[PDB]
Symmetry: D2
Subunit: 327 residues, 4 copies
């Protein structure tokens, strides 16, 4: 338990943006998703609130984690633990204090933990082009996203894995719809139109008598939740450079692997996947310029301005990569 102290201390940062997730992954014996999720649940007192037997929770978490591919560079259990922990911080954003119910909170966190489960390390288009069984089952539409959801729920059926066994029928139905709405929203093909609404919304932004954001209908409450987890999934560039660079190393490794596979198959190599003609630095700045920043700028507003330290970090990291661009 010598390191049990290190892990324990490391976890003390679970509420902080910039947790040493990679260290935790090492300290936990490659169980970042299980320990982090377990801490967040204990912390938010979700086990007692939803009467979740401790053994059941841990068995499901290990099972869920086990279904993330250890051989995949980016989309693995570490990325999952990261999006969970990040959504967890984004939920505690002052501008949302006491806004969401324990169920909505449970939904956001659960959705984050399962959002990429059983990811093969290749894109939807690659699965589509090859006529993979997954693309055939989902009609080439949000192939992976649909799959992530199905697996996430199916695993609840394994031995002692149903963590929602004590929710009421109504709670289960409401939880399930939200989890689905959120995960399906992680598909980058939804990003554009998804962003517009986050804007159109921040325009009419309303506050309560408590100074916290005001959300009425399901429509508005889910959009915030959708964009929120969507931000957590696209939060690598807003973290301290040290962590961010590791994520970039990982995503590039996954990209290049796909490119090697497309190349050996005589398939057109996907954008940014050709290791023989790459622009890692230039791609990061462009990624930040046309996608991440535009998204994270709006959320910075929405939770005005508890996201400041986060937005400045994004801009700082951009400059860094910018100064790394060859020629």
């Amino acid at each position: 338990t010598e390191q049990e102290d290190v892990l324990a201390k490391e976890l003390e940062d679970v509420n902080k943006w910039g947790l040493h997730v990679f260290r935790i992954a090492e300290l936990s014996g490659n169980r970042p998703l299980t320990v982090i999720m377990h801490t967040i649940f204990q912390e938010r007192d979700l086990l007692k609130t939803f009467k979740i037997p401790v053994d059941t929770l841990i068995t499901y978490l290990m099972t869920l984690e086990d279904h993330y591919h250890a051989d995949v560079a980016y989309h693995n259990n570490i990325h999952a633990a990261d999006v969970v922990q990040s959504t967890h911080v984004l939920l505690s954003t002052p501008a949302l204090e006491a806004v969401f119910t324990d169920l909505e909170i449970l939904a956001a966190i659960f959705a984050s933990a399962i959002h990429d489960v059983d990811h093969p390390g290749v894109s939807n288009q690659f699965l589509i082009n090859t006529n993979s069984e997954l693309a055939l089952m989902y009609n080439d539409s949000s192939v992976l996203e649909n799959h992530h959801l199905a697996v996430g729920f199916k695993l609840l059926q394994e031995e002692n894995c149903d963590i929602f066994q004590n929710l009421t029928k109504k709670q289960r139905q409401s939880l399930r719809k939200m989890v689905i709405d959120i995960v399906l929203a992680t598909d980058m093909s939804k990003h554009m139109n998804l962003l517009a609404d986050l804007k159109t919304m921040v325009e009419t932004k309303k506050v309560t008598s408590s100074g916290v954001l005001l959300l009425d209908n399901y429509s508005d409450r889910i959009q915030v939740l959708q964009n929120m987890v969507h931000c957590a999934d696209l939060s690598n560039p807003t973290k301290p450079l040290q962590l961010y660079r590791q994520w970039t190393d990982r995503i590039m490794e996954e990209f290049f692997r796909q490119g090697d596979r497309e190349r050996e198959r005589g398939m057109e190599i996907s954008p940014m996947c050709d290791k023989h003609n790459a622009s890692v630095e230039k791609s990061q700045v462009g990624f930040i310029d046309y996608i991440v920043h535009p998204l994270w700028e709006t959320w910075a507003d929405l939770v005005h301005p508890d996201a400041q330290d986060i937005l400045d970090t994004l801009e700082d990291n951009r400059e860094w990569y910018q100064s790394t661009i060859p020629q």
Copy 2:
């Protein structure tokens, strides 16, 4: 099925019925009976031969026939409305719509193949119950498709999967380019049959009619994929919603069937202590009032707009719809 190389008595009657394949109002139920319950197979085959689709896409005839029978075999005979007769009707209706003057020479053979194939598979393996029923019972289908367009996704998955059975790949001779294109259009069209897409689908159709463009010929102008697929989606959607525009004799048979299917679902919901879906309670129904509402809020608005787009091609269809609307209206007991 023949003898000595000549059609049998039945076959000849059937062939004579099939002569109206290019006409709105085909005696589809008569064809279903005459063909030994193979309306989808015979109608699809007639249309493929009519449009020379076998040669154009090099589809071996035995493969086409084997796939068709296999596809038809996966529609449920015990389902009153959503069966092979409904599929054959939608195929034939789409076929007629494709040949409307306002669209002559607008679509490629591939887009034509896509609209017809999508129509043929659009409701395959339909269980006779709504998406919400599948969602409420936590069915495996709903679990697989995340409660989103459960049936429509299933219809597509099954339509394509059946291509893998013995000698069923009718697209074996298409290039990967053709197949990727064909597949995307078919998927776009069938997913658009989910009623949850009706409103937006109609909105865009209206918008298009607003900015409508033609050429030296009174033929519509469609540039991008977005407008071409929009028209194809609304075309098959209209076909799927064409029952009220057919001669009253046919329209009523369809109403009897959808009502039977609705009531059957209602009885299942009642057995299960579930809330009975709208119009599915045989004990508290208003068949006539419901057909009137169906026309006033859904069918007429859709077809009216379509008639604008292909004006004046759909005039008669529109007038028939209005005649049938009045008929049902006058049937409402007070």
Copy 3:
């Protein structure tokens, strides 16, 4: 009311070989499996014993019944209800009194209930020959049987359908193995081996202090349960002629329908499936002589003299059909 009293009265014969199962099918609005299963569960006190909530039982039964095809002439919910009821009678045979446990009883009945669920009305060979998805999934081996089991168990996951939610893990563990063993044995491909082994047991027939049969190991126990359900699945010829004749009209219609489909596809028409070259009477006599009678004669030996009247009804029916053979 009336039709309700008629149904209630008909169900009174639930413990008798020769129940008017078709009449019950009509009277219940096509719910023979639901009403007969429910009746039998009450009769054996299974709801109390395994604490099965009544709403859960009814919902599961209707769900299971709904997954049998109404358009299938023979392999539909009436056949299922019939096998369930037939197994229920065989279980009460004197020579087996107090031999099986409540769990083993439950397994045999549940197995009977789900043994042909979602049957498409065509043989394994037809499915194999057309390269169907089911055959590909099950490697052409007991395709339908494996499928009936997978569906039967899967349906327990639908809303309020888990009738074993109160069984212990050990009970679930044992019940599942027994159900699997029983249904896989319904494949006619395993008939010959089943009969042989059954006979062997008839030779090593070990009685008990109470004069009832003696079964030590799981192997002998499951063997008797497998043959029992097998006999039930093959009991049509041993039932009152009015019933038997209906069964024959149904199986023949299913056979002929497959034969037409095979004819359509240019496939070789399966044995007895060609309506243009049929011999219904002749075929039934052959079915009794080479399969049904051999099996039952043996079962009669094991439970002597418990099934004398069943055996006599068979031999009687055999003659009826024989004399029906035109010349």
Copy 4:
């Protein structure tokens, strides 16, 4: 297009290594490195070319290579033993056994293709855990296969399913009769790889040896499908269990890998609070003693019997097995 189905600049070193493809003891680990982790693709391609299977069954070369890369891609790189290297090894081992003098000209080209294909797909998509683990956790796989030869059934289903991916149908030019016969043999062979069937397989192999028949040539006489398929099943079974009969240098690497996989399952079982499977507890292991036992109760009885069937073809293989058995014996801590 590449010489070995895979691009490589070390092509020279790789080509040299592949010269021993017909030899027991090929340096498969070296080939995996030289091929860029494509041992299965490279070895299968080499064997197919060598046995002239591409021409004999009109298998397009790009199709073969795409299928192989696809098949190989579905073996898990994170699994220490049951991965693409094990697959490549069993394929190559079966290839050698098929060429043994006592079996010359006995099997048809189709049976040869079946044995080799079966060897290639026999452990595809293996999760690194046993059937029992999948059963006790109520996995979807066990549910689908009713807890019977769960993995073996899945390996077959995936191996065949993958033929449906883009340009992956290597059997597209086989007549219907050939496909049916090939499919049956492959299924019979892979299902026989389940250890639960080992004892019965051995017993039948022994019986065959006891009534062994040879033709006018010096080769084994196999009259019926039953005897033919039995020999092929045991052949692939021996290949799957051939690690202890390979040069010690290779055998120890295989041992390190299976032990790594065993212990990982052990840690997972421990985590979940499950009883730890035999030899899976890294805290109470006896690696050396376990290998001797494995050889004494399973591997040697099997190979001793196979050696009798093909006497004296496998004499050196048996000699190696025995030498290796002694090495581990002396490695046992006293």
